[PDB]
Structure formats: structure tokens, C-alpha cells
């Protein structure tokens, strides 16, 4: 038959975890070691105002468009970060069993409508209630500083903190997140898919693997699997809202540029 047993699902999970470790430089384990002070290096440089942002741009190890103003500059660094994670997600996807065998067009479609949900999920790993890590972990920008940016740029990031804090309360590790992100990517609900049943099948397999994985890895947790399915739904709404805010910037901040790679992702949604 075609219905995988527990042993098959466990092996499937291990392969996805390996593809994860292979393709992501900033894992939650690494991020947490930095954020909890376990790292052997000194605490990250803190960006909490204009003076420190300027200093970080001069002393922190990171081709942006010409400087215009603080809020727009930060907007550009958001884009750059996003582009890098998109490249990692693409390589991660290619390494997930049964992704590379989908129609090329379906692979493209899945990444296009999937990357942002995945980005916001993984973002939680490098975030706490007070800020997030930048410059590959060597910097830390405060939530308060991002709130100080002028509208509409301040309105973009705050929603992600709200989501991340609650998401982090679930206490997932990298092994869990590997399956979660795979499930987000291999999503049979995306528009323009040629072979929906194939994608549906793969997603369901990933989800079953995830349930069994959570059982062993978090034996004492309650309703963790259902909670994560809800998180997936929450991410869809987060992205819709984020895309709306990006469109507003596109129409009102005509002096602000958008990376071509991100332009295509958002191309056919407005
Ligand atoms: C505008 C925008 C915001 C987000 S919210 C998640 C954030 S915040 C962030 C960041 C914030 C401040 C700095 C600073 F100050 F420079 F240190 C920094 F380096 C990095 N990086 C990310 C991923 C996500 C995407 C996006 O546009 C691109 C798209 O939608 O594709």
C-alpha cells in the first residue's frame, strides 16, 4: 500500500531535519545560545536608537540603495534579510523528499506563496519580547527602536513580535521546526497548482510525521499538535495583512524601492 507506517514517518522526519540543518545558518539552537548568553562570544551589539544604528552601519559586519532616511534604510535591511532567507528556504525545499519530483511550475508556485509564512515562523527563533537578532546574530535591534520608525514602517514589524512571543511559548526546537516549515511549504492550498492531490498527499505525510514527532519529543505537552495547526492558520492571516501593508508602501512611498525578487513574489496579489 501507500500508507506509511510509524517507522517510515520517523525516517521521513530525520531526512527533513537533516535538510534543515544543511540549509539554515541560523538555527533556533544557535539563536537561543546568543539570546540567553550561553554563547562564548560577548553579547551582541545593541541597536536601540539613531546613534547605535549609525555605529552599527560603520562597525557591524553585514549593496543597499542610497540612503534617504532612517525608516527607509531599515526597510531595505528588512528586504535584504528576507532575500537571504528566501534563498535558504529554496535550498531547504529542494532537499525535502518528494519536492524536487513535483512539476517545476508547482515547485515555483509553492515557494512563491509559501516563503513569507515560513519566514515569519522562523523569525520567532531569533526574536524575544524585547527585540530580534541581526547581522547573523552579532547585532540585536530593539522592539522599541522599530516602534520609533515613522509610519507606515513602524506598523510592519510589531505584528511579527506579537506572533513570535506566543509562538515561542510553545517551546519548539529545531527538529520540530524542520517539519513545521516543510508543512508550510508543501501546502496544497496554494493558487495555480497543477497537481493538487500530489501536494496534499505530501503535506499530510509531513503533518502525520509531525504529530508522532511531537509525541516523542514533547511527551508531556497538551494539545501541541492542534495548537500548531492553528498557528499555521494564524500565519496565513499574518501574511495577508503584511502584503496589504507592503502594497500601501508601494503606492504611497514612491521613493522607496523594492527588491526585484520580492517584487515578483508580490507581483500577482494586487
Ligand atoms: C519590511 C519587511 C518586514 C518584515 S518583518 C521581519 C523582519 S524585521 C528585520 C530587520 C529589522 C531591522 C533591522 C535593522 F534595523 F537593520 F537592524 C534588520 F536588520 C532586520 N528583518 C526581518 C525579516 C519582513 C519582510 C519585510 O519586507 C520584505 C518582504 O515582505 O518580503
Author numbering: 167 to 228, 234 to 441
List sentences quoted exactly from the publication behind this structure.
There are three peroxisome proliferator activated receptor (PPAR) subtypes termed PPARβ/δ (hereafter δ), PPARα and PPARγ with different expression profiles and actions. PPARδ activation improves overall metabolic profile. PPAR C-terminal ligand binding domains (LBDs) are 60–70% homologous with large (≈1300Å3) Y-shaped ligand binding pockets (LBPs) composed of three sub-arms (Arms I, II and III) that display significant homology between the subtypes. GW0742 was developed using standard medicinal chemistry and conforms to the pharmacophoric model of PPAR ligands, yet displays 300–1,000 fold selectivity for PPARδ versus other PPARs and full PPARδ agonist actions in cell culture and animal models.
